[PDB]
Amino acid sequence: SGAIYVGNYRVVNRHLATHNDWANLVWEDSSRDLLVSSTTAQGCDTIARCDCQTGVYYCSSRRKHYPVSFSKPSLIFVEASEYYPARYQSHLMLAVGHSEPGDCGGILRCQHGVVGIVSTGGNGLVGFADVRDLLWLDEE
Ligand SMILES: Cc1nn(C)c(C)c1NC(=O)CC#N
Numbered sequence: 001s002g003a004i005y006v007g008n009y010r011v012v013n014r015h016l017a018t019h020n021d022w023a024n025l026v027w028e029d030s031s032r033d034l035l036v037s038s039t040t041a042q043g044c045d046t047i048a049r050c051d052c053q054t055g056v057y058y059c060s061s062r063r064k065h066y067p068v069s070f071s072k073p074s075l076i077f078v079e080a081s082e083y084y085p086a087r088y089q090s091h092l093m094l095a096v097g098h099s100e101p102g103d104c105g106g107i108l109r110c111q112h113g114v115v116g117i118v119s120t121g122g123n124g125l126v127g128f129a130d131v132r133d134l135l136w137l138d139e140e
C-alpha cells in the first residue's frame with residue numbers, strides 16, 4: 001500500500017484505488033496502473049522533475065529502503081498479475097530488487113524528490129510507475 005500527496009492530489013496504484021478515490025477522480029490510466037484523486041488538505045510531497053536512474057525505494061515486504069539503479073520509463077511486457085492481464089504496462093521503470101504485490105505504493109525517490117511508486121515485480125525485478133512526466137501534479 002502507499003500514496004504520494006502533492007498539492008490537492010493523492011497518487012495511488014489504480015488497482016488499489018478506493019471507492020473514495022473513484023468518487024473524487026482527477027485522472028486514471030490503466031496502462032500505467034496510476035490513479036489520482038482530489039484532496040481536501042494540500043499535500044507537500046515533491047515530485048522529481050529529472051532524468052535520474054538512481055534512487056532509493058521503500059520495500060514493505062522487507063521493512064527496508066534499498067538504493068537502486070533503474071531504467072527510464074518505457075512500455076514493458078509484464079507477466080499476468082492479480083489485477084492486470086499479461087500486457088504492455090506503460091511509463092514503467094525497472095530495477096533489480098525485491099517486490100511482492102503488497103509492496104505496491106512504496107515510494108522511489110531521487111535527489112529531486114518522488115520519482116514513482118512500486119507497481120510490478122517478479123524474477124528479481126521491481127517495476128515503478130513513473131510520475132515525473134505528470135507536470136500538472138505541480139499546479140492547478
Ligand atoms: C510490486 C509487485 N511485485 N510483484 C511480484 C508483482 C506481481 C507486483 N505487482 C502486482 O502484483 C500488481 C498487480 N496486479
Ligand SMILES: [Zn+2]
Pocket residue numbers: 048049050051052110111112113
Ligand atoms: Zn532525480
